[PDB]
Structure 1
Amino acid sequence: MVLEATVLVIDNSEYSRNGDFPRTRFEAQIDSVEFIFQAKRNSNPENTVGLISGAGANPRVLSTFTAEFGKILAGLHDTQIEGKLHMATALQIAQLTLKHRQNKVQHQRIVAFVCSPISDSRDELIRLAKTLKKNNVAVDIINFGEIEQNTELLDEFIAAVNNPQEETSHLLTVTPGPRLLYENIASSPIILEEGSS
């Protein structure tokens, strides 16, 4: 997607600690933010990306929209490693951040890392799913947390969001064993994502 403003959600939960992905899953995501940043920029040099956390009780703004990978990276150094994901507040704040744009043309996209099963209720996520498609904002889920012990709740939410429409949602489920986290996202659609209209 040419012309895109992306909010990344970094989860810094007690499940990112765990050594599941090389070296640790927590340290893997650092590499993953840098790789994503360069992929997006080379697609269309006028794209930008920002980084919010979902971790902690209250999502904390690290970095707003920037074309610069070091800034985002500086922001990654501030982190709480005892936070707990709270998706419901993260999505809502994320949209807001996206409504201010350098140019109005750039689409509204969330790519969110999800490392822990979503503690919020099923009923909440049903309301959230239709809140998102209403304002033309789609959410692309990097999953490898919820598969661990819980059924893919996230799938029903993605299906409602996806309609024939330029904005398309996807559920991307990542081989959980070693194969390098950044590599899986690399061999998946990330800018080869097509429309649905």
Structure 2
Amino acid sequence: MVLEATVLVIDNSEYSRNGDFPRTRFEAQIDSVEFIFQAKRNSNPENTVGLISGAGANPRVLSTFTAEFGKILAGLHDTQIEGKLHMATALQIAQLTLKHRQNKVQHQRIVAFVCSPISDSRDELIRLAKTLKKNNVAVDIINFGEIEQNTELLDEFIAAVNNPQEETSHLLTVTPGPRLLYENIASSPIILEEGSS
């Protein structure tokens, strides 16, 4: 997608360090983040991307909006794997971030990697979902955390967020067993992954 600003949310847990995807799931993510950035850049040079964490109770901004590959790659390598996901916080911290834009014309996209079962209430998210679709913030959930061994709660929320909009919400399921996470992403829409109305 052209004239888009993309906050990637990198999640690091006790489930990233598992051999769920060989060698490890963490090192398979390394591939995917790079993959997605170079392709956004190649569609439009004005597209800029930052990196924030869902790890810990307090999310950390690792990277700001940048057009350069180095700032994002360097934070990505530092990882504290005993952090735990708080999706509920990360979405909000993401919102503020997406607010500051070199051109306010640009769409607001969140791409979030999901590596563990949620800590976050169903109800909590019902409120939160209604907040994002008000400010025309769409969220694509790459999921392989929840569907490891529990119901896909995240689904219900993505469905309601879909209506006529700048951008539409997507729910992209990557099977959680060994099959290569980056290989799936490549094979998915990514040039047809656009802000459909």
TM range (shorter): over 0.9
Residue 195 (structure 1) shift: 4.2
Residue 182 (structure 1) shift: 0.8
Q: Distance in 1 between matches of 2:78 and 2:179?
A: 27
Residue 78 (structure 1) shift: 2.5
- 3-state SS of 2:110 partner: strand
User: Structure 2 length normalisation: TM-score?
Assistant: 0.96
Q: Which moved more, 1:179-188 or 1:135-144?
A: 179-188
- 3-state SS of 1:139 partner: strand
State whether residues 53 and 59 of structure 1, in contact with CA within 8 Å, keep that contact through their aligned partners in structure 2: yes
Instruction: Provide the residue aligned with 1:193 in structure 2.
Output: 193
Q: Distance in 2 between matches of 1:171 and 1:182?
A: 17
**Which residues of 2 match residues 89-108 of structure 1 at below 5 A?**
89-108=89-108
Q: Deviations over 1:107-153 (max 9, x none)?
A: 10000000111111111011111111001100100100110111111
Q: Distance in 2 between matches of 1:195 and 1:68?
A: 24
State the number of aligned residues: 197
Q: Deviations over 1:159-187 (max 9, x none)?
A: 11111223111100112233221111111
State whether residues 107 and 166 of structure 2, in contact with CA within 8 Å, keep that contact through their aligned partners in structure 1: no
User: Structure 1 length normalisation: TM-score?
Assistant: 0.96
State whether residues 2 and 47 of structure 1, in contact with CA within 8 Å, keep that contact through their aligned partners in structure 2: yes
Instruction: Provide the residue aligned with 1:82 in structure 2.
Output: 82
Q: Deviations over 1:23-82 (max 9, x none)?
A: 100111111111111111111121010000000121000001001111100111232111
What percent identity do the matched residue pairs reach? Answer: 100
Residue 190 (structure 1) shift: 2.5
Residue 191 (structure 1) shift: 3.4
> CA, structure 1 residues 194+15, in 2 after alignment: closer, same or farther (shift >3 Å)?
same
State whether residues 143 and 174 of structure 1, in contact with CA within 8 Å, keep that contact through their aligned partners in structure 2: yes
State whether residues 136 and 166 of structure 2, in contact with CA within 8 Å, keep that contact through their aligned partners in structure 1: no
> CA, structure 1 residues 185+134, in 2 after alignment: closer, same or farther (shift >3 Å)?
same
Q: Distance in 2 between matches of 1:24 and 1:55?
A: 18
Residue 194 (structure 1) shift: 4.0
State whether residues 110 and 139 of structure 1, in contact with CA within 8 Å, keep that contact through their aligned partners in structure 2: yes
- 3-state SS of 2:108 partner: strand
Q: Distance in 1 between matches of 2:122 and 2:89?
A: 15
Q: Distance in 2 between matches of 1:124 and 1:108?
A: 22
Unaligned runs of 5+ in 2: none
State whether residues 40 and 191 of structure 1, in contact with CA within 8 Å, keep that contact through their aligned partners in structure 2: no
Q: Distance in 1 between matches of 2:134 and 2:75?
A: 31
Q: Distance in 1 between matches of 2:152 and 2:140?
A: 14
> CA, structure 1 residues 158+54, in 2 after alignment: closer, same or farther (shift >3 Å)?
same
Q: Distance in 2 between matches of 1:150 and 1:179?
A: 19
